[PDB]
Design a binder for this molecule. Structure first.
Ligand SMILES: *[C@@H]1O[C@H](CO[C@@H]2O[C@@H](C)[C@@H](O)[C@@H](O)[C@@H]2O)[C@@H](O[C@@H]2O[C@H](CO)[C@@H](O[C@@H]3O[C@H](CO[C@H]4O[C@H](CO)[C@@H](O)[C@H](O)[C@@H]4O)[C@@H](O)[C@H](O)[C@@H]3O)[C@H](O)[C@H]2NC(C)=O)[C@H](O)[C@H]1NC(C)=O
Ligand code: MAN
Ligand code: CA
Ligand code: CA
Ligand code: CA
Ligand code: CA
Ligand code: CL
Length: 222
């Protein structure tokens, strides 16, 4: 007779997938055992339907389970900023009369990918350039500007670092690495109102490799 239900080898499986996977990417596999000979022992897997968290959609929109192999594939590329974990409930069910069934839970965890370069929020870039007015009579180490940038990623992938490079004519300004404050280090006395100091603003994140964005800073001396 059909005197054995399908036992999942594990009541809860745990799987990790990195963000921005290819559609159809194999996520994992589940296994239920039916110690019965013949059709009493042929087991079929089904995906149990369920919402995704709070009004995220349907679970069948995100994964699919193979009915014979227990293979669990992804139907779309996962976005970590949009979804970190999803719960997939699978049901193993034999072919006896009446059917015997059991359930298990796959906890799919989404890992972060460095898929965001830092963005310069303020001062806003224009044609890849930046304007900064610096009154001639200013004291040393006074905040001329404040650079604010954002990065959506996690950990070091969102850890930003600011830098000034390729100053001309001379190295008169500096920027705090984590601060984003642009201060006046050099002397600014023997200068005409029109004079300009050009630099390259460099904003990096802590990726490996890092993602970098840049701007063209112009300090005009008023
Ligand atoms: C961003 O800014 C650049 C300005 O250039 C930069 O500015 C500074 C910050 C430094 O980075 C410099 O090193 C850079 O040069 C703007 O560039 C201009 O773009 C316009 C179009 O958008 C260009 O005009 C076109 O180019 C052709 C000009 O032909 C001329 O020469 C022939 C002789 O061979 C002559 O017959 C003709 O009449 C022209 O005199 C032309 O084919 C075309 O029809 C049109 O005129 C212009 O030349 C660029 N200037 C420079 C200096 O490169 C960018 O437009 C700006 N972008 C944005 C989004 O703001
Ligand atoms: C598998 O099937 C049994 C009945 O055969 C159900 O009780 C169970 O909930 C699952 O659907
Ligand atoms: Ca069975
Ligand atoms: Ca993303
Ligand atoms: Ca990311
Ligand atoms: Ca990043
Ligand atoms: Cl697919």
């Amino acid at each position: 007779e059909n005197d054995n239900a399908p036992l999942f080898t594990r009541p809860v499986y745990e799987v990790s997938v990195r963000e921005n996977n290819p559609p159809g990417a194999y996520l994992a596999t589940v296994a239920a055992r039916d110690r019965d000979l013949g059709r009493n022992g042929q087991v079929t897997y089904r995906l149990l339907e369920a919402e995704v968290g709070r009004a995220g959609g349907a679970v069948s929109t995100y994964v699919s389970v193979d009915p014979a192999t227990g293979a669990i594939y992804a139907l779309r590329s996962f976005d970590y900023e949009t979804l970190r974990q999803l719960d997939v409930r699978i049901q193993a069910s034999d072919g006896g009369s009446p059917q015997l069934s059991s359930s298990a839970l796959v906890q799919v965890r989404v890992l972060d990918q460095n898929d965001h370069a830092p963005v310069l929020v303020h001062p806003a870039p224009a044609n890849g350039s930046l304007e900064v007015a610096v009154p001639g009579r200013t004291a040393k180490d006074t905040v001329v500007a404040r650079v604010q940038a954002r990065d959506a990623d996690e950990g070091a992938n969102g850890e930003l670092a600011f830098e000034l490079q390729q100053q001309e004519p001379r190295e008169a300004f500096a920027i705090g690495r984590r601060t984003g404050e642009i201060l006046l280090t050099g002397d600014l006395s023997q200068e005409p109102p029109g004079r300009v100091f050009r630099a390259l603003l460099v904003i990096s994140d802590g990726g490996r490799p890092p993602l970098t964005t840049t701007a063209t800073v112009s300090f005009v001396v008023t």
